[PDB]
């Protein structure tokens, strides 16, 4: 049993995942609240180092989809989805390379965005 | 008894469900409060990874 435990302890020290564990690494992707990001231990950082790369892959897929959606999608199809005025992209240039910033939408990111919007709303007050 | 416990400990480490346990994974489906989502451990995330797929199945039925 001692050898079994030791060889099962030298595996959790090499990969980083340890049985039933409390992890913050799945809630720390993207611009999140300071309190959530302040509880990152070594294992959580190891697990986030792979999550960021996997999310970069999804972002690179989304950029491809965005670029292809500005040439194969007609206005009557984009307006059908958005029900708003169809914004047009230039002709001989990539779509969303300059004026767009695509990322992964997580619950913590949305919570931080809402908390920052509320803070801004409080900051302006009646002056603006 | 040691072998029984060890082989009953190597099962709770492979699946993720551990006898009488406190779980948040059933209360973290969908857009929920930050405090509820902030108490997700490894086992809860393992159990939520199946709950999301099972809910995707129900959503695909509902779309039909």
Compute the distance between CA of residue A33 and CA of residue A29 in angstroms, rounded to an integer: 10
Compute the distance between CA of residue B33 and CA of residue A124 in angstroms, rounded to an integer: 26
B41: three-class secondary structure by DSSP: strand
Compute the distance between CA of residue A42 and CA of residue A13 in angstroms, rounded to an integer: 11
Selection from B41, B12, B26, B57 nearest residue A43 by Cα: B41
Judged on CB neighbours under 10 Å (0-12, 13-18, 19+), B40 is buried
Q: Report phi then psi at A22, rounded to 5.
A: -90, 115
Compute the distance between CA of residue A20 and CA of residue A110 in angstroms, rounded to an integer: 27
State the number of CA atoms in the 13 A half-sphere of A47 facing the CB.
20
CA–chain centroid gap for B26, Å, is 7
- Taking the Cβ of residue B60 and every Cβ of chain A, the question of whether any pair is shorter than 8 Å is answered with no
Resolution of the coordinates, Å:
3.5
Judged on CB neighbours under 10 Å (0-12, 13-18, 19+), A92 is exposed
Q: Say if residues A43 and A15 touch (Cβ distance below 8 Å).
A: no
Q: Which residues, other chains included, contact A111 with Cβ-Cβ below 8 Å and sequence gap of 6+?
A: A32, A33, B34
Q: Output the six-digit token pair for A71.
A: 């040439």
- Taking the Cβ of residue B18 and every Cβ of chain A, the question of whether any pair is shorter than 8 Å is answered with yes
Contact A20 B42 (CB under 8 A): yes
Q: Say if residues B39 and A36 touch (Cβ distance below 8 Å).
A: no
| Alpha helix segments (H runs only) across B1-64 | 2-7, 34-37, 42-63
């Amino acid at each position: 049993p001692m050898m079994i435990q030791y060889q099962n302890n030298e595996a959790e020290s090499l990969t980083g995942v340890k049985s039933f564990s409390q992890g913050i690494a799945s809630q720390a992707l993207g611009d999140v609240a300071a309190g959530i990001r302040g509880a990152l231990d070594a294992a959580s950082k190891r697990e986030l180092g792979i999550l960021r790369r996997l999310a970069q892959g999804v972002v690179e897929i989304g950029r491809k989809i965005i670029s292809m959606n500005s040439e194969f999608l007609s206005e009557e199809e984009v307006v059908r989805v958005t029900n708003e005025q169809f914004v047009t992209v230039r002709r001989d240039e990539l779509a969303g390379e300059f004026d767009l910033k695509l990322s992964i939408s997580t619950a913590e990111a949305d919570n931080q965005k809402a908390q920052e919007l509320a803070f801004m709303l409080q900051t302006m007050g009646n002056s603006l």
